[PDB]
Amino acid sequence: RYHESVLEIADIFDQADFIQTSDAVRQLRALMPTLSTSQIRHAIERIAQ
Amino acid sequence: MLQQPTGGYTTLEQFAFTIRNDGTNATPTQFLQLLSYEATENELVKKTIPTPETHLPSARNVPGNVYIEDAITQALFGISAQNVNAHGYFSRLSALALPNTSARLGLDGVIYNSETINIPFYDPAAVANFAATYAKLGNASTPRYRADMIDIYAHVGLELAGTDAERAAGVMPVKRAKFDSWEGSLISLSRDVVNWKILAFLIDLCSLEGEALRAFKTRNRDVFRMMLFIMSTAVAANVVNRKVTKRVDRVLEYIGVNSMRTAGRTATITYDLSRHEFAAKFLQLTFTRWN
């Protein structure tokens, strides 16, 4: 055994640019109901009109 | 469930090899006396025989049961035209080569998957050694395995027509063998020697020990010089029959030298390309065991 979980590209690999690292928005990001490729596509579609 | 007392199944009246000729039925020994021969001056010298390869083919899974025995004879001395046979269920034999197997080999010439009710079969222990030598006959047409269909025949002619005065030196003069005949002749001995129970012989060769092998080879060096004669006229270059006043002789062109196509055509038994590879694989495998 070993307790297996998931990591982040948000923690290791921080760059002031290209990886948005603000914990206020890390708190914001940890709320949405798990987006796919179609959920995020209709997101950049409703914001158009 | 017959057993051998080390006399072997050949020391039995159950199955005995007898040719029919002369208006009555005779033993091979009586026949061969008629074969008289001269010389034509092309020295047929005894070469060495290369050892066979140990690898045994796999008996591809097969339901039902094939008459393993049938094909062994139906290829060697088969009379009726036999078509290509390089392919076939010819290696189910190896399924008897392993120690504990249930597959049994009956009398008559079949290979059962499971011993069934009311069928007499050879002894499961002495049929094992027969397989670890003859199941090797499965790969008879695999390239890079087939024997050579030329040199073995030199060995063959030194056997049925070689006076000992010659074999003890390893060299002999090519002979032209002619016996006296009747009607069908050569074709009649084939239709005859086919149903002989060859398995009843070969099993003995791989089991019987020095005590009863020197004695076995002495009483059966003739049943061998019979299924070796017919197998030879399937090679000879000519079969033309000389004529006396009322008598007829079956001069055979060149016993012991191998050509590629039958002299018989219509007069005698005939081989095929697929069979030339087969006879060389048998003749090679058997000689090491015999000699």
Partner: protein, 49 residues
């Protein structure tokens, strides 16, 4: 554009269907290097196959 609706809604389908009433044999193939059917046979000692 397929994988999301392929490894979620269709994934739970096999997960349940694996253990039906009638299904009984193993058709597993997670190792193409070594796997055989291991078939059975109906045989009688009185000549049947």
């Amino acid at each position: 554009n397929i994988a999301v609706a392929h490894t979620d809604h269709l994934s739970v389908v096999y997960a349940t269907m694996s253990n039906f009433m009638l299904n009984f044999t193993n058709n597993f193939s997670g190792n193409h290097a070594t796997f055989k059917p291991d078939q059975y046979v109906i045989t009688s000692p009185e000549g049947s196959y």
